[PDB]
């Protein structure tokens, strides 16, 4: 190895020289810049210069002499004959100059920290570096003060390295070893170098324990180790047990036999991604991960996966990784920030010192506007005294160019001293504040709403010059109130808000003449002006939000065919109507009828448009193959006339009271007569049948009288639900002119009001609010009931099997426990029979198409699982600045029979723990079965590289086994064994705890197999795994038996009902919101001009990444109404349980079911329930790839609850507890929204980093700051609503509702609204939320916000909930804030 040692010594000699050149370079530029440039112009004092830099000077001379003395030996270049030792030995005494420096260094750092707290001094100190020629963003002065103390400590290491290479024959050898004793003793006598030496000693020590090392030494690229340990490197090829060392810029991994090098990664070219427990992969080499994360070398494009034994070690590793990332990134962003701002502060100062006539350099000179010459600027910098050397000036002028303060006029040149023409980026207007102007709408709406939500209002009637003004706010009281709520820190900021509100037409002074001031002047929102009727007469009170037309409509869905959708349109009586429906078309199958008026085409209100433009909308939808969504005029009762054929029917009927159309044949005379599925038959040839069976209806028809059940006729049948289409298909698989007049009731009708308004863009807009009966509700309630019956069939079947393994009854406590268990199994049996019946009831019911609030209490029935008064409030909007959006807010009565009082919440939390523990233990054994298969696969492919891979796999198997032992050992299983203590089993609690001795023996036998006979390894694995499977099943069995015993079957029946009502409403809400989004119609972000396609795609990808948030305006009066309190105490516990629900999606076509994009299905136990939203090919293909691949979408819930009236009088001790319970609900909901907001923020940070043109990332970041600044405001507000500070309490009113509405709207939640009836309080919140959505997102002119809010609560489609529930007593809120009351009509006349 002679040539190696030869070239290696030359490399040490080069490293000494090369690193000293740049280090003395460092000392030279710092001396030049700091001392001389600080004295030219001035805040730093003479003594402060002395303390900072002067001990550099005394070092610097010794180091220049040392550099010369080294460069003299190493002439003309470093050569193998050279000596240096004597040059150290002579300098050894000269290096004792460090004794003063080190004694002062602590004082110099301690000065620098304080001088960096003073903005001017920090900027002056960075300026020194900038003019010198050093990029400020690359090295800190904070580092430079240490850099001398580092390099004296390096000299011992430098000698040690030269000594590693040089042979004993070389004459420098004895000098170098003497010089090592010297440079060591030098650094050892001084505390500061001793510290730097011991911290380097650790790095060299570790490197000395590592063999095989590649790349640069640890001392030279890292300051400290951060973390050390063994992990499983899962990698391409196969798994590798390894040691991992993390150091401050470098991760290095080694084979563990002291250690042997394998490879290293710079923490810059690293990237990290987390993976969830139970995840497995394709396009990555792994298996069922738990306790892992993924690493990406961005330089080599290499993924690999770490795994740790425990979660605690996963967390220790990801936390150290995150910290190292944040420390490096925070220095870099802190230096870039600090540096940019001083360049700005100087740039602006010097700009406004150049714009005065004392200087005037910025002149016009093709003609070039507002320019200057670089020579003159540098000269002027020397003349004013800002520089000492012209070189500094070209450094500053190039820095102001590269930082964007200036540029060249011709698009050619950098900055030069050279009479070249330049210009400041001020001149073309590159700076502005307009982000404070777009947010003034949102702030305005949020403000108006909070003020009018006050129970003791601050906007009110007040007299001026002894004459009443009606709805006025003193400008100074507005300021006092903006401040008291924390919206603005200063009165000045509140005045700036006030001025911009007045400019954007929110409010005015009581005379035209004044701006907003902090004076006693009176101010009034135009939204009151329009409602109290207080315009001057010559403006006619133009109602710029008005009603257009009330609609009653059936929603159809049509998939495109070979030439069209299956129909034509015509203009008739100045309306668009259905001209002709093609026989046997998918439109006929939807139930489109000839002569019907059409209210919307893909949510565009086509009745408002010219006929030639509507044909173009149909065509554009068809050309883009969109699934068509109509609204068509349909009456609540209808007359249909059927040809009575002699041989066969063409339709099916069933249902008792009322009878209903179960099915109809495609292309039939019945279908062409307009018979359609779900129609509930009232009369036949005049004869009433509304309480008469399907046979009585069928008996009118000649074919039925002839053939009875055989009367069906070999048509392709179409059906009322997918449930009916399934039971028909299954029935098929198990087997392989005279007239009649029907008067029918059309179920599933949407009642709508088209509002018109003029937008803030000055253009006309329409809103289609609809109250919709959720078509799926009865079918979905049956499917959830079926799923609970299926789960309970699996539960009863397991627990009966276990009681059949316990053959003996040895003691009376065994008999008592068995009798309890037998009874509870029979009870769950009775529950299974009930839910199958109730599902058959619900499948056998079609009217009323929503649960009315029950007129009377009664014993339990199938409708008690459907949500009471469940209706979806759609709100479609037509083009602002052609845009379409479709907000969804479901309304229901709060679900009803509370649970939070009935449950010892401990029982629920134990039952969660048991059902999750059982689900986990079952998954962990399911992986363990696949693991033994993957090892047998590897062994077949094999029959030291193979040994490393195999050892990694076998270790990972034992890790999985530990990922079971930690579940079986736990306190949850121990408590289960204490509950099941009467039941006979093969193991006691003491046994399994002691059976870690069985896994220690098994591991030792596997290791013995690896050492003595590698072909006995499968037998050893099988033995270990079979023993563990017996323990896992014995755990599963104990947990189902503990569950059977601790389940209260009566409460569970209730819970299921509340859950079923809630989940149905939730799933219906999300169904509608999902179908809006998958239709390119959801948009929480219409404020920011955003195209609804993009907003929808962003929400879909967001929901895939984050979960669905369901937000409930709980809107119950628990302090006052005992019924509503029981509904609150139920829904709170229930939404906590709905958090465990996972949505998921699958493609499934029909063309055998009318009008249903979605067919739900349900899988999984109560805990971890899964809803499969079966979607059509079109909507499924608009899912994100995460959800298309079958992955689970998690539901998060929040529930915000404020009384819409005041509480009058002092609360009783019970009412105080109701308010406290209300406050707890709001607290838990605030934490859960904040988490969803954090997970959205994190998701947006990742999204902004996605590999794209850097200009688009910068624009995205500037965009995303506005939503986030508004959201952070809404969070501050929510915290002050939910946790009011001492003495601010009561001052906030019901504002929690419009504000938590705004929050969960902004986040993109599915929105739900509830009250004891679902038919009055709910109208007041939905009407406000919709009016606020219009005002904050679609630019409804702010003067109209209350007008829409009251018109909606008077004339909107919601009054139809009262005209469908006339028998239900409800109370319009008398104690409500002016935002929630109806406004009385104006008293002064002139309407």
Residue numbers in the entry: 42 to 83, 90 to 304, 324 to 431, 436 to 806, 839 to 983, 1015 to 1030, 1063 to 1108, 1212 to 1659
Article excerpt on this structure:
P-Rex1 and its close homolog P-Rex2 are highly conserved GEFs that activate Rho GTPases (Rac1, Cdc42, RhoG) to coordinate cytoskeletal organization and cell motility. P-Rex1 is a 186 kDa multidomain-containing protein with an N-terminal catalytic DH domain, a PI(3,4,5)P3-binding PH domain, tandem Dishevelled, Egl-10 and Pleckstrin domain (DEP) domains, tandem PDZ domains and a phosphoinositide-4-phosphatase domain (IP4P). P-Rex family members are autoinhibited under basal conditions and are thought to be synergistically activated at the plasma membrane by receptor tyrosine kinases (RTKs) and G protein-coupled receptors (GPCRs).
Despite ongoing limitations imposed by preferred orientation, we obtained a final P-Rex1 single-particle reconstruction at a nominal resolution estimated by Fourier shell correlation (FSC) to 3.8 Å. However, due to anisotropy effects, we estimate the true resolution to approximately 4.5 Å consistent with map features. Clear secondary structure features are present in the maps, allowing us to accurately dock our closed 3.2 Å DH-PH-DEP1 crystal structure and the 3.2 Å DEP2-PDZ1/2-IP4P15 structure into the reconstruction (T4L was omitted). An AlphaFold21 model of the previously unsolved four-helix bundle (4HB) IP4P region allowed us to build a complete model of autoinhibited P-Rex1. Overall, full-length P-Rex1 is locked in a compact conformation with two distinct domain halves. The autoinhibited DH-PH-DEP1 domains form the N-terminal half that makes extensive contacts against the surface of the C-terminal DEP2-PDZ1/2-IP4P half. The interacting surfaces are conserved between species, with the PH domain buried in a cleft composed of the IP4P domain core and the prominent 4HB region. The DEP1–DEP2 linker seems to act as a flexible point to separate the N- and C-terminal P-Rex1 halves. Intriguingly, the P-Rex1 PI(3,4,5)P3 and Gβγ membrane-binding prenylation sites are off-axis by around 90° in the autoinhibited structure. As such, we hypothesize that the cooperative binding of Gβγ and PI(3,4,5)P3 to P-Rex1 at the plasma membrane results in the counter-rotation of the N- and C-terminal P-Rex1 halves to align the membrane-binding regions along a single plane.
